[PDB]
Every structure is written in C-alpha cells, then in structure tokens.
C-alpha cells in the first residue's frame, strides 16, 4: 500500500527503471510525530539505485510511481518496513511513516 499525492510540477515520464541510480531529496515524518530521517538535513540527496531492496518497500514503490521533478508524499504502511520489528531509537513498531519525496534523479 503506497498512497501517492504528487505535488504537480515535474515531467511525468522519467520513471526509475531497474539498476538506475536515482536521487531523492527525502524528508521523513511520523504520523502524529516529528521527523526521523532527512537527506535535506544532511544535504546529501541519497543517490540510491532501484532493484536491490536497499530502500524499504514503502520508499521503493513510491519511487517508480513518480517521475523527474515530481513531488509526491509517501504514507508508508508499517508492515513493509518496521511494523512488528521497529527500529531501536528511530522507528517504533507499527508506525505509518510519512515522507516528503521529490524525485530529482539521475540515470
């Protein structure tokens, strides 16, 4: 379950394909909570590739459903990343995570 609410400007066609190292200015958020992880805070815009399951499934499926320039808004389900496990100190178990994802990519 990935609910994409794209803020309109972009190109609408440059989709991430397999093995494409793509660039996302991500900015995390918790449902009824604050930020937890931000490439914008690090100013290191997270050059990640598609097809290795490096990123979580809530962040991976949101990438290919966007295009270059687009600014979507992830509402990631708990069961795809940390719903029963939970990260120690960052992500509690059964958290519905929120992301400011703007696909300004490469390749």
Residue numbers in the entry: 1 to 107
Describing publication, verbatim:
RyRs are calcium-activated calcium channels critical to excitation/contraction coupling in heart and skeletal muscle. Ca2+, ATP, and caffeine are well-characterized activators of RyR, synergistically activating the channel by inducing a rotation of its activation core and pore opening. We use cryo-EM single-particle snapshots of ryanodine receptor type 1 (RyR1) to exemplify the discovery process facilitated, and the new insights revealed by our approach. Broadly speaking, conformational changes along CC1 involve the cytoplasmic shell, the activation core, and the pore; those along CC2 involve only the cytoplasmic shell.
In qualitative agreement with the experimentally estimated association probabilities, the binding interactions become favorable from state 3 (“S3”) onward, becoming most probable at the FINISH conformation. Information from at least six structures along the functional route on the energy landscapes was needed to identify a thermally accessible pathway by MD-based piecewise free-energy simulations (see “Methods”). At the hotspot, the trajectory crosses over to the +ligand landscape with ~0.24% of the probability of association with a ligand, terminating in the region of lowest energy on the +ligand landscape (“FINISH”). Three-dimensional (3D) movies compiled along heavily populated conduits from the START point on the −ligand landscape to FINISH point on the +ligand landscape (the white curve in Fig. 1a) reveal the conformational motions relevant to ligand association, in some regions with near-atomic resolution (see “Methods” for more detail).
